[PDB]
A paper describes a structure:
The flagellum is the most prominent extracellular structure in bacteria, with a molecular weight in the hundreds of megadaltons. Structurally, the flagellum can be divided into three major components: basal body, hook and filament. A ring-like structure formed by the proteins FlgK and FlgL, termed the hook–filament junction (HFJ), forms the connection between the flexible hook and the rigid filament. To assemble a filament, flagellin monomers are secreted through the flagellar basal body and hook, and polymerize at the distal end.
Here we report the structure of the filament cap complex in its native environment, assembled at the distal end of the flagellar filament. Three-dimensional (3D) classification identified the different states of the cap, resulting in a final 3.7-Å map resolving all five FliD subunits. The final cap model contains 5 FliD subunits and 17 copies of FliC in the filament; the HFJ model contains 13 copies of FlgE, 11 copies of FlgK and FlgL, and 14 copies of FliC. The flagellar cap complex is composed of five FliD subunits assembled into a pentamer with an overall shape resembling an acorn. The D2–D3 domains assemble into a star-shaped plane and the D0–D1 helices form a plug-like structure beneath. The D2–D3 plane and D0–D1 helices surround a large cavity, much larger than that described previously, and the D0 domains form an almost closed constriction in the secretion channel. All five FliD subunits show a pseudosymmetric arrangement, forming an asymmetric unit with three adjacent FliC molecules, labelled FliC 0, FliC +5 and FliC +6. Moreover, FliD 4 forms a substantially smaller interface with FliC +5. These unique features indicate that FliD 4 participates in the incorporation of a new FliC, which occurs in the gap between FliD 4 and FliC +6. During the incorporation of a FliC molecule, the D0–D1 domains of FliD 4 rise upwards (Δ = 25 Å) and shift in the clockwise (CW) direction (θ = 18°).
Residue numbers in the entry:
A (entry chain C): 51 to 198
B (entry chain S): 261 to 416
C (entry chain C): 298 to 446
Write the structure that this text describes.
Amino acid sequence: ANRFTANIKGLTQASRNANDGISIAQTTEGALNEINNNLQRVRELAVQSANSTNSQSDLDSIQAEITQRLNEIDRVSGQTQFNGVKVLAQDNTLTIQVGANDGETIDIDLKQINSQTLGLDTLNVQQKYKVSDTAATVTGYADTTIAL
Amino acid sequence: ATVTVTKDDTKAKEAIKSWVDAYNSLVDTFSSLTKYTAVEPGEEASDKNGALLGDSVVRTIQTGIRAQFANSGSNSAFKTMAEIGITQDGTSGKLKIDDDKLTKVLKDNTAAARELLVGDGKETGITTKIATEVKSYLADDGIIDNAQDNVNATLK
Amino acid sequence: AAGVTGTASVVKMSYTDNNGKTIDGGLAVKVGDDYYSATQNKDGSISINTTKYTADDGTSKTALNKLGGADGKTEVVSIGGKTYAASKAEGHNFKAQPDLAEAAATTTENPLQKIDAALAQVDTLRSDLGAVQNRFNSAITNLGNTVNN
């Protein structure tokens, strides 16, 4: 009876541990779905840039939303957490006890998913302007607070 | 007595809005079917969560439809929905239309849109590829039916 | 006083695009190899704009706004031998937050390739989470039945 009771209590506690594990995994998915949607919008905007006839001003305008979306990815990645665990914090592994004896666990792997790690921080589509440099029509005068 | 002939974009725009609305409703259905909700530590998922939470079929379908947007080989000058004034949100995944831009492109280059959306109808056409995949899903072997047959397992 | 000098003069850069479209630039101090944006003040001083930041040596510093970027006109700053955006560099913890990467220099190659690789990673991960979800559901069922018995 003692063996049976010990196993019963251990298995109950293991059930609750499994509760926590499933919850963390589900939250991870919840974050990843929105991350993926953002990336898909980014790809849309890139292939939009693929329109060769568009102007460099248009390219810059598009890059604006690209940057907005990248910052959004970073925000969500730094936001999502479970019970004080920043889920996407870093390349990490979790072992969750679900048995009733030593070393009886389910293993989960998590990644540092962010703009930097994915390498899309530096992504850009703009084209360098032609710039003509001249003294320009600087009308009037300068009346600086000279050190007389 | 004079007669005039011009061009009709009304029917087209008209038509397109229905498709966009249907897609948005489909996305809504996905969201409802996998509505997530956090719970206290140590307690299994909440009952209110969607019945398909954690399923892979929903992801399969949602992803499969999207890539059909990036049609391949279409001779249409445009290669993306933005060029025709339709954009997809990166946070919600829903489709929106800049109606006036759509009108302008309709009057301008309707032929390119024809080719992009349908064209010959053999392989060109986002609607063409999408119809292929949607039929595949709806098939007797289609993922939904084979998952509803592993759920005719969940049943029988 | 910055210690680097040259053909220091007041200019207003003007612009052109591949389409040859008429586009204008802005006021800056031409030096030569470097061009630094300038603001016109109430006293007529064409003062070169500067960027504030936390120095990588532990102090607080500020440096002139140099034009650049992938467009060639963005205001950028150089810290630790590398050029970073003026917009980002403002007051950032350059000392112990190296997350601020260099401002894009030119057009990016195969951005579609990069995007596709990232999306592949994301999809693979999501599938893994689904698999482990199913594993845990099986585990809970096992535990319930075993406890009953």
